[PDB]
Amino acid sequence: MKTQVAIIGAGPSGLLLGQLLHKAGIDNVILERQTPDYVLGRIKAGVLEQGMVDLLREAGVDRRMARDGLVHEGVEIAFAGQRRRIDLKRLSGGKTVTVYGQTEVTRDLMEAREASGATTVYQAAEVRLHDLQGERPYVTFERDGERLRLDCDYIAGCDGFHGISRQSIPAERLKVFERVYPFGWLGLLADTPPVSHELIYANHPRGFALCSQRSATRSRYYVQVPLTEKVEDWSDERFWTELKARLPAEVAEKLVTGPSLEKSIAPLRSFVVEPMQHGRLFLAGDAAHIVPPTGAKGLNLAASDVSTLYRLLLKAYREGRGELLERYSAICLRRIWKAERFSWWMTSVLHRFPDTDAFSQRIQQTELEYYLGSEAGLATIAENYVGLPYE
Ligand SMILES: Cc1cc2nc3c(=O)[nH]c(=O)nc-3n(C[C@H](O)[C@H](O)[C@H](O)COP(=O)(O)OP(=O)(O)OC[C@H]3O[C@@H](n4cnc5c(N)ncnc54)[C@H](O)[C@@H]3O)c2cc1C
């Protein structure tokens, strides 16, 4: 078969890019290793930036989000006795964030695509990329036991952290920057009313805790745990008792608990690769960079990469300006590093790190006291949280 743009991965990155391209008249094919329900089983992101909200609207897949998403104007940080609210809307100059689950965004995009009739091959096994630097690259894969070949002009690697795309670039061509954190996040999804109308990030001596939500009758909670923990060692009971222990008494007493729908541990990591492209292969989303969940930047960075790729591909196709695709990495990397810095900062001030001396503990506390007490400090958090402008 043949197409214009081959997309590896049917996660939100690939589906969004595919939708934007299809709409602009650029044919694309999406190859996914797993099945539709496997993809739909991933409970991940809950917070979207305005830029991503507008892109969904531009892709024409915002009906349900507009109806079901929750717009938030503030967020809270609880630390050593106090709870401080950051008014995102006034400190950022009017911007807000939207709480709408990643499973939901994915479902909406999958429906949009199924209806458009664009090509999507699930269970595409053994995907391999070829002739990345030639004029006619191609992808080979197996559907059943037959190896099919797909010819194309460009390939977008939207296959996540463990995808084949990033592995397909000569190692010597890429420079990696990575930081692994000595802890993960144990998350629990429950069909219970959230404890607050806004998110609560808590720095507690026992470790980090976070109170989030998906809707008015569905919550998502997290607690920082050592990388040596097993989710099977965390019963629902143990989770709730631990969560309550890390929250302000007044918050903990309002908590409606309940049986988990999902429980999993996500280890924290920072990862960036430079550049984000090779020949006719362009990386997007988790395939090029990972940010710890603390700043709620991952999916939002994927959205900006995609927005940039989509627009550079449009110029190349409709305007015949193929030369602009060479500036893809420079453009994306500017935003990526800024968000990595914020996610890193958020992570360092909200979590309890092992083997930290007295001095560094006091500084972590003072960082919070200063940034949450200064008008200028609050503004740096707010403008970064709502999302820095797209370039
Ligand atoms: C606990 C947690 C909380 C988070 N919270 C937020 C939040 O609130 N806001 C936010 O912005 N970000 C958040 N994120 C991050 C966000 O979920 C990711 O950045 C986002 O999933 C990236 O989407 P993607 O399409 O690049 O990759 P993925 O979701 O990883 O999808 C990639 C697709 O590629 C497929 N694939 C893999 N390898 C192959 C192959 N060889 N061939 C074919 N297909 C393949 C995979 O099966 C997958 O379906 C969070 C993440 C976690 C873990």
**Distance, CA 3 to ligand 1 centroid (Å)?**
25
- What is the rounded distance in angstroms from the CA atom of residue 78 to the CA atom of residue 82? 6
Determine the topology of domain 73-95+181-268+352-388 in CATH.
D-Amino Acid Oxidase; Chain A, domain 2 (3.30.9)
Q: Which two tokens stand for residue 219?
A: 């919550």
Please state, as a whole number, how many other Cβ atoms lie within 10 Å of the Cβ of residue 256. 11
The 10 Å CB-count burial string (b at 16+, else e) for 168-177 is bbeeeeeeee
Contact present, 267 and 229 (Cβ < 8 Å): no
Contact present, 276 and 288 (Cβ < 8 Å): yes
Matching fold, domains 1-72+96-180+269-351 and 73-95+181-268+352-388: no
Listed residue (335, 333, 349) closest to 381, CA to CA: 349
The architecture in CATH of the region 1-72+96-180+269-351 reads: 3-Layer(bba) Sandwich (3.50)
Preceding amide of 194 cis, omega within 30: no
Active-site position among 12, 22, 44, 72: 72
- What is the rounded distance in angstroms from the CA atom of residue 302 to the CA atom of residue 281? 16
Relative to beta strand 209-215, strand 82-87 is unpaired
User: Angle between the 328-350 and 298-318 helix axes, to the nearest 10 degrees?
Assistant: 170
User: Nominal resolution in Å?
Assistant: 2.2
Active-site position among 100, 201, 328, 371: 201
SS3 for the chain is CECCEEEECCCHHHHHHHHHHHHCCCCEEEECCCCHHHHHCCCCCCEEEHHHHHHHHHCCCCHHHHHHCEEECEEEEEECCEEEEEEHHHHCCCCCEEECCHHHHHHHHHHHHHHHCCEEECCCEEEEEECCCCCCCEEEEEECCEEEEEECCEEEECCCCCCHHHHCCCHHHCEEEEEEEEEEEEEEEECCCCCCCCCEEEECCCCCEEEEEEECCEEEEEEEEECCCCHHHCCHHHHHHHHHHHCCHHHHCCCCCCCEEEEEEEEEEEEEEECCEECCEEECHHHCEECCHHHCCHHHHHHHHHHHHHHHHHHHHHCCCHHHHHHHHHHHHHHHHHHHHHHHHHHHHHCCCCCCCHHHHHHHHHHHHHHCCCHHHHHHHHHHHHCCCCC
Domain ranges of the chain: 1-72+96-180+269-351, 73-95+181-268+352-388
Give residues with Cβ within 8 angstroms of 370, minimum separation 6: 377
Q: What is the dihedral of CA 82, 86, 91, 92, to 10 degrees?
A: 150
Q: Which atom of ligand 1 is nearest to the CA of 212?
A: 8
- What is the rounded distance in angstroms from the CA atom of residue 276 to the CA atom of residue 28? 20
Q: Which two tokens stand for residue 67?
A: 């109806």
Is the Cβ atom of 6 under 6 angstroms away from ligand 1? Answer: no
